[PDB]
């Protein structure tokens, strides 16, 4: 279910971001997306530990 979240972005699909928004700002958009998913993965890994 964490993949359905937007994490402040305009879309939850990265292909839509790449084919919809300009790459200079799509870089910071994907940076926000990857860091949100990385925080979720870190939380899951700590819970698993």
């Amino acid at each position: 279910k964490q993949l359905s979240s937007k994490f402040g972005a305009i879309s939850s699909v990265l292909n839509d971001i790449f084919s919809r928004l300009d790459p200079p700002e799509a870089e910071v958009q994907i940076d926000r997306l990857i860091t949100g998913r990385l925080q979720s993965l870190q939380t899951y890994v700590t819970q698993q530990l």
Binding site: S19, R20, L21, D22, P23
Partner: protein, 49 residues
Amino acid sequence: YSVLYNLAPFFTFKCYGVSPTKLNDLCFTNVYADSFVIRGDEVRQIAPG
């Protein structure tokens, strides 16, 4: 959009949002075409927020 790029001497995409040269590659729908005439420096007033 290719013919629209050179039918008129309009300003070369001074706006934020969709990618400039990718407009032939999206599948958008439900567009709105509102036209009006203003005076001088009121173009900067027309912006999100």
